[PDB]
Design a protein around this ligand. Structure first.
Ligand code: MET
Ligand code: NA
Ligand code: ZN
Length: 546
């Protein structure tokens, strides 16, 4: 009865999608597809994160306006997401008019509720560029440990936090020039007004993964502070109402893009839904954000406080994932492991990576390692050599000898029913984001199917007097077992699933449809459904990434 709204983190419009970021997008897409295959009403949206100084820097580097820069990168991101089967219902932009309006609405409601303060602050200013400098565009000497080259917010060597004005001998990263100190009025969101609210919110059952417990404990012990939400002109972003020449910091309007992408989606595709159905405080529907562990603070503290302050509902849960390593090391251009999503697609089948990720993904916030030799072996053994070969080895006889038509009865009803009944556990694993468990359970079923075929030996039956019906019965069971496997893998391998729908002539492929055992059922001529992963193609991708 409850409908679900799901998002992925919004990528910045300042560069391409890389293979490491695909982990969370593929995780979310698998979940959405599996939940839909189980009959849930799931809406799935994303958008480009379009604002901020970093995006202005890229635009100028590329000789174009910010508006043309974000238009270019949005098309690139959509291209890459689509290439990996990450299919959103809608892909928008934080620059949209819908997001401008909702940003103003949330700000003004918070301002009138008492959650906004304005005050003059001392800020570093680049005199060459005529720009006030935010913390990530200032470097200097940490006042505590005296280490060079630290940004304006905190030191990586000793961990001290500070205002950028406490750095010794600072520099602007925009020009290298020495900044000067000036005054600028800044707008602050009064996050401390929500300390007790968030201490309860972050600990509600299902809101956050259990591992984030200690990380939040640190955060609440350290104490919440007013959040600086304004940026001075020049800034590519939304102007703050009644604050001339002041803009919302990109992170204010970025999560609002979740609302606005959804809002623009339902305006064309779900006339049965309205915005309040998901975002009014009395909503009975669910909202989930898939996000990396590096942005949990924005999503677990800033975001629900801003929503609560504006009388909107808050996310039901944050699904948090770790990072991807490659061959047991951080991804580097020098090792050719900082791989653009576009480069992978120029050399390899995307469903290789969907499967490999699924076989390792769990509900835990952990880093996943992509060992490239293991990637080749795992995908080839599991999919090409085991799962797809079950169809091949059974279809061989049905296509060649039995007019492409499965037997009129199921000769192993209990065995097939046992594969059907295993769907309940597989569905529960997908829903719990325990993808590695779902894959293991499916592969255990594939082993049982090969065990059955090996026991019956259709190749021997085809060479024995009078066993024609038994060859057909056995191969028909094998195809039915394969069909169950492909239904269960469909959230992970949607293209393979479409191909199996064509091969088995099946219009429906959701979980309910699997209860229909195929009998007297014409199938198409079998053709290979997946090529093996070629190690040279993997190496060509690595070499193209150096
Ligand atoms: C509202 S999610 C925004 C995520 C941000 N663009 C990032 O890359 O970290
Ligand atoms: Na995980
Ligand atoms: Zn330090």
């Amino acid at each position: 009865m409850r409908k679900i709204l799901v998002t992925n983190a919004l990528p910045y419009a300042n560069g391409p999608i890389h293979m490491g970021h695909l982990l969370g997008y593929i995780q979310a897409d698998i979940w959405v597809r599996a939940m839909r295959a189980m009959g849930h009403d799931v809406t799935y949206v994303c958008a480009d994160d379009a604002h901020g100084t970093a995006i202005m820097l890229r635009a100028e580097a590329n000789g174009i306006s910010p508006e043309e820069q974000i238009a270019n990168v949005q098309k690139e991101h959509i291209r890459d997401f689509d290439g990996f089967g990450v299919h959103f219902d809608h892909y928008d932009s934080t620059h949209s008019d819908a997001n401008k309006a909702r940003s103003t609405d949330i700000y003004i409601k918070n301002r009138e509720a008492g959650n906004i303060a304005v005050r003059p602050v001392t800020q570093l200013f680049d005199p060459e560029k005529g720009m006030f400098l935010s913390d990530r565009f200032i470097k200097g000497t940490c006042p505590k440990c005296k280490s060079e080259d630290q940004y304006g917010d905190s030191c990586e060597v000793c961990g001290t936090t500070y205002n950028a004005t406490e750095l010794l001998n600072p520099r602007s990263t925009l020009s290298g020039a020495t900044p000067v100190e000036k005054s600028s009025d800044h707008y602050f969101f009064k996050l401390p007004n929500f300390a007790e609210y968030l201490q309860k919110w972050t600990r509600d059952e299902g809101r956050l993964p259990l591992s984030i417990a200690n990380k939040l404990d640190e955060w609440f012990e350290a104490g919440l502070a007013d959040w600086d939400i304004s940026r001075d002109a020049p800034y590519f972003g939304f102007e703050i109402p009644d604050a001339p020449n002041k803009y919302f910091y990109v992170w204010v309007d970025a999560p609002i893009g979740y609302m606005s992408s959804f809002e623009n989606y339902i305006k064309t595709k779900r006339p049965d839904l309205n915005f309040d159905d998901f975002w009014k405080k009395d909503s009975q529907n669910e909202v989930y954000h898939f996000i990396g562990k590096d942005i949990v603070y924005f999503h677990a503290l800033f975001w629900p406080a801003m929503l609560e302050g504006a009388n909107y509902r808050t996310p039901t849960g944050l699904f948090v994932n770790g990072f991807l390593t490659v061959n047991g090391q951080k991804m580097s251009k020098s090792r050719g492991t900082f791989i653009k999503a576009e480069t992978y697609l120029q050399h390899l089948n995307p469903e290789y990576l969907r499967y490999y990720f699924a076989s390792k993904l769990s509900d835990k916030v952990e880093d996943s390692d992509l060992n490239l030799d293991d990637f080749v072996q795992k995908v080839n053994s599991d999919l090409v050599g085991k799962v797809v070969n079950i169809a091949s080895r059974c279809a061989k006889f049905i296509n060649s000898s039995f007019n492409n038509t499965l037997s009129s009865t199921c000769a192993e009803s209990d065995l097939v029913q046992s594969f059907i009944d295993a769907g309940d556990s597989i569905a529960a694993a997908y829903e719990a984001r325990e993808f590695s468990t779902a894959i293991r359970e499916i592969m255990a079923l594939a082993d049982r199917a090969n065990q059955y075929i090996d026991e019956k030996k259709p190749w021997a039956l085809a060479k024995q007097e009078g066993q024609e019906q038994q060859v057909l019965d056995v191969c028909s069971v094998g195809i039915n077992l394969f069909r169950q496997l492909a239904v269960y893998l469909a959230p992970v391998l949607p293209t393979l699933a479409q191909q199996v729908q064509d091969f088995l002539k099946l219009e429906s492929f959701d979980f309910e449809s699997r209860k229909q055992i195929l009998v007297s059922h014409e199938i198409a001529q079998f053709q290979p459904l997946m090529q093996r992963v070629d190690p040279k193609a993997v190496a060509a991708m690595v070499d193209a990434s150096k």
